[PDB]
Amino acid sequence: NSVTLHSWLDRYEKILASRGIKQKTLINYMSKIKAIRRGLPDAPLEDITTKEIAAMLNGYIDEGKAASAKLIRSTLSDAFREAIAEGHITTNHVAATRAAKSEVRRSRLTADEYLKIYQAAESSPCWLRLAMELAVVTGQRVGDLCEMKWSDIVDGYLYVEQSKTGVKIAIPTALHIDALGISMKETLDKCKEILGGETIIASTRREPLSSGTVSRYFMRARKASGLSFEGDPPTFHELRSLSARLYEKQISDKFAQHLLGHKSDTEWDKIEIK
Amino acid sequence: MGRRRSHERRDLPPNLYIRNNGYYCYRDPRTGKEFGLGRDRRIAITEAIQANIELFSGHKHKPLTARINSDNSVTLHSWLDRYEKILASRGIKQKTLINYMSKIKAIRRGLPDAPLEDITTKEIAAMLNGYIDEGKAASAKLIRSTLSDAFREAIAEGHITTNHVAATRAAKSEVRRSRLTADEYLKIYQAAESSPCWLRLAMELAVVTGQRVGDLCEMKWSDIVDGYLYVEQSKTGVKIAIPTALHIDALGISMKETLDKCKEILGGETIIASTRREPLSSGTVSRYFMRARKASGLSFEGDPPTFHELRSLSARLYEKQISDKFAQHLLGHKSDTMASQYRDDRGREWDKIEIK
Amino acid sequence: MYLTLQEWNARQRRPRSLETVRRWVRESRIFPPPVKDGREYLFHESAVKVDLN
Amino acid sequence: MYLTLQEWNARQRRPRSLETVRRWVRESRIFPPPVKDGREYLFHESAVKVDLNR
Amino acid sequence: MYLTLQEWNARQRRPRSLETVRRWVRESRIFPPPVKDGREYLFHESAVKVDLNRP
């Protein structure tokens, strides 16, 4: 015999542990499995009906967390699909449901807003301002900005190894944003004088900092400025979105794509005469 | 009663028993005694069944007053009421939601409020075809499409196993609306004289820009900067910029001459206002256009043209006047599937094939 | 995983003689039915004495 | 995946004496044969008993 | 890739003694036979003990 839902979810986690994926990634799925535990009773898989699955799913959709429902529904479905592979059951009662379409409500950042936040970051340490200008001049993600060492800079270049995708690019130390008044070179040297550490962005103790504190302190200066938005207040990651939006009208669109680390393509167009 | 109902009787006929040793007996309507029938359940049951007769329609249960009950109670209308709520959470564009409700209110009036599982495919086609013979072919297509989706959500929430609506056919419906010609445009133009002034300007502005009627009565004079008319559609929501340097040589109208002709005559916050310096609904600009249509004394095949046809005629002229790549961006289109369908004639004027 | 004839009858309420229990085997009076290993029968831990008629 | 004679007898319907386990191998009553590797048989992960008779 | 005397024996179904493995090498009970390199023996990746006897 040996059935039951929970018993399977325990033998399912080990399966994903051999899939060979990122660390943080494996953790994301685990958090989804635990939610299913306290979301559905402990009984054989062949007993679980599609109704109970949608009863728990919609429960997270009404609470406002529609995005979470999508992942939990997409993860719970994979468990059953791998369960059938073992010969446990015969059908996937999760493929009968429908994922709730969620729309991104995280507002973007403009030029005026950024200037209002940078000045409000005065009460904050002396590395936040540097992290802001750097994240906008390089347009890189907060994750790699913390793993940047002064050894990466080679003859006027900036070797950056993206952790997320894995793309490898080299941003020259000649860039400059013509809208806020920031220069790549002047920004880097400003970090070598003020900060002074092994990494371009360090702490007051001359030591590397986590990527969870760089955007954390940025939030404090966000609510301290006193700016209202529509939806969810922008974050530190938005500096990356603002970076490209500026470089597209400062140089070229093909430049913003190469700066971010993209390869493929994927508002108010103009109707030319021809 | 003495024994009342018991638990074993719940699955046994009236004149049947069930001892402690899993044995069954055959009561006698003469003295009250009994004999030995069988050891099995369905066997001893069927025996007592063939003895007098079967059960009945449902269940007896008739003590003195009443008690708790928890039986089945499936219903279609009950589900529909819960379906209308789920739709309001799918993020719709107002109007579209009303369309659904208009199709749901017709189903509950054409189909019993019986259990969903009891709803056969036959009773679904009986009502469907009832609206196909009345000429309402397009209606039958929307009603079946909306009703079919209602069951897909039902299956997802543990109610039914299969959709008996995905088995029926969808009634095809060809467009009966005729197309407008340039020689017909001027005729209506002269028949709009008896009509207000804004009707002779809204018609020239809906043929020079080729914009939707709804997005034609929502354009303010502030949406015109440096000679560019920034228009944000409401249907698809695609933004565009129409230059004031556009004129049709097939009708003799300029967009810079028509625009300024709406600033003095009309005068208002909107390019196309009324006689009270106030905005005008989209479901009225077309109304006053139909009057001049019938008054002009015309004659078409099938359903007569309309104000929306001004968008079709505009693109038809913008394809021969300049190019095809021009009458594809001005309309706000991007796909390459309707660029050939919005070019058709439908059987109005023969596609004159020149040397080229 | 299984239980011997003695280990199964010893857990019963009214432990009958070996022969009698062996007879309920040939008469299929025990379901789930026991399987024969080599010389002894190994019933299931949930196997019960289904007394019918 | 190959197991020993002791580990194999532990994963059967009924664990018997090591002597009896060795007997089956000698009498060729298991598909496939263990194949002596040095001085200790190595059962296959799918090597199950068959049992004959007359 | 060539494994050593210890590495090869550490990947068998049942790890034995170093002196024991040395005995097979002399009894040709290792197919294929290891190669002499320096002072130790280098076995093949798919090297597995065999029985050169037909009773």
DSSP string, A175-239: -EETTTTEEHHHHHHHHHHTT-SSBSSB-TTS-B--HHHHTHHHHHHHHHHT---SSB---TTHH
What residue type is B163 in one-letter code? N
Comparing alpha-carbon positions, the chain E residue that sits nearest to D3 is E13
CA–CA dist A67, A65 (Å, integer): 6
With the C-alpha atoms ordered E12, E17, E22, E26, is the resulting torsion angle positive or negative? negative
Find how far residue A212's CA is from the centre of its chain. 11
Is B316 annotated as catalytic?
A: no
**Can chain C be said to touch chain D, i.e. do they have 3 or more Cβ pairs within 8 angstroms?**
yes
D14, C2 contact by CB (below 8 A): yes
Is C touching E (3+ C-beta pairs, cut-off 8 A)?
A: no
Q: Is B333 a catalytic residue?
A: yes
Tokens of B22: 């899993």
C53 touches B at CB < 8 Å: yes
- Rounded to whole angstroms, the Cα distance separating B35 from B15 reads 11
CB B25 within 8 A of CB B37: yes
Count how many Cα atoms sit within 13 Å of the Cα of residue B234 in the half-sphere of its side chain. 14
**Which of B175, B248, B163, B176 is closest to B206 using CA atoms?**
B248
Between CA A46 and CA A91 the distance in angstroms is 8
Q: Which residue in the list A237, A245, A258, A263 is annotated as catalytic?
A: A237
**A135-160 residues labelled b (16+ CB within 10 A) or e (exposed):** bbbbbbbbebbbbbeeebbeeeebeb
Q: Are B311 and B235 in contact (CB under 8 A)?
A: no
* Cα A110 to Cα A239: distance, rounded to the nearest angstrom: 9
Characterize B84-93 residue by residue with b for buried, 16 or more Cβ atoms within 10 angstroms of its Cβ, and e for exposed. eeebeeeeee
Q: Which two tokens stand for residue B137?
A: 């072919």
Asked if E51 lies within 8 A of D36 by C-beta distance, the reply is: yes
Dist. CA A179–CA A112, nearest whole Å? 10
Residue keyed to tokens 């229990």: C21
CA dihedral angle for residue A75, residue A79, residue A80, residue A85, rounded to 10 degrees: 140
Cα–Cα distance, B336 to B298 (Å, whole number): 34
Cα–Cα dist B29/B120, whole Å: 43
* Rounded Cα distance, B35 and B19, in Å: 11
State the CB neighbour count (10 A cutoff) for residue B334.
12
Alpha-carbon Rg for chain D in angstroms: 10
Find out whether B257 and B171 touch, Cβ atoms under 8 Å. Answer: no
Q: How far apart are CA D14 and CA C38, in angstroms?
A: 10
Half-sphere exposure (Cβ direction) of E38: Cα atoms closer than 13 Å: 5
For residue C52, the chain B residues in CB contact (below 8 A) are 22, 39
The token duo for B20 is: 């402690």
Q: Are B307 and B215 in contact (CB under 8 A)?
A: no
**Residue B256: active-site member:** no
D36 contact residues in E (CB cutoff 8 A)? 51
Give the length of chain E.
Answer: 55
Please tell me the distance from the alpha carbon of residue B244 to that of residue B227, in angstroms, as a whole number. Answer: 5
B51 residue type, one letter: A
**Please, what is the Cα angle at A88 between A82 and A89, to 5 degrees?**
90
- Spatial CA neighbour of A243 closest among A139, A93, A101: A139
Query: Closest by alpha carbon to A133, among A212, A86, A72, A194?
Result: A194
**Chain D residues with CB-CB distance to C39 below 8 A:** none
* CA–CA dist A60, A67 (Å, integer): 9
Sign of CA dihedral A212, A217, A223, A225: negative
Q: How far apart are CA A70 and CA A56, in angstroms?
A: 12
Show Cβ contacts of residue B227 under 8 Å, excluding neighbours closer than 6 positions: B243, B244, B245
- In 3D space, the residue among A221, A241, A226, A215 whose CA is nearest the CA of residue A117 turns out to be A221
Contacts of E13 in chain D (CB under 8 A): 2, 4, 37, 42
Rounded to whole angstroms, the maximal C-alpha distance in chain B is 109
Cross-strand bridge partners of residue C35: C42
The residue written with tokens 């006027």 in the block is A156
Letter string b/e over residues B287-298, b meaning 16 or more CB atoms within 10 A of that residue's CB: ebbeebbeeeee
Structure letter (DSSP) for residue B353: -
For residue A248, how far is the Cα from the chain centroid?
22
B93 has catalytic annotation? no
Q: For chain C, say whether D14 makes contact (Cβ under 8 Å).
A: yes
Residue B247 DSSP SS3: strand
Q: How many CB atoms lie within 10 A of CB D35?
A: 14
- Residue D11 CA to residue D49 CA, distance in Å, equals 12
Answer yes or no: B77 catalytic.
no
B14, two tokens:
């009236």
Number of domains in chain D: 1
Alpha carbon distance B232, A41 (integer Å): 51
Cis-peptide into D32, omega within 30 deg: yes
Taking a C-beta distance cutoff of 8 angstroms, is the pair B246, B208 a contact? yes
Whether residue E14 contacts residue D4, with contact meaning beta carbons closer than 8 Å, is answered with: yes
Domain containing residue D41: CATH number: 1.10.1660.20
Chain D residues in contact with E55 (beta carbon < 8 A): none
Is A240 an annotated catalytic residue?
Answer: yes
- CB pairs D-E closer than 8 Å: 17
* CB of D37 less than 8 A from some CB of E: yes
CA neighbor of B139 nearest in space, from B148, B149, B129: B129
Per the structure block, which two tokens stand in for B345? Answer: 């004639």
Q: Of D37, B57, A261, nearest to E48 (Cα)?
A: D37
| E strand intervals along A13-150 | none
Supply the DSSP symbol for A8. Answer: H
Torsion region of A233: left, alpha or beta (phi above 0 gives left; psi -120 to 50 gives alpha) = beta
Helices (H), B270-320: 282-285, 287-295, 309-317
For an interface test with E, which of D7, D37, D39, D41 has the most E Cβ atoms less than 10 Å from its Cβ?
D37
How far is residue B5's CA from residue B3's CA, in Å, rounded to a whole number?
Answer: 6
Evaluated on CA atoms D41, D46, D48, D50, the torsion sign reads negative
**Could you tell me the residue range of the domain that residue D39 belongs to?**
1-54
B76 burial level (CB within 10 Å; 0-12, 13-18, 19+): buried
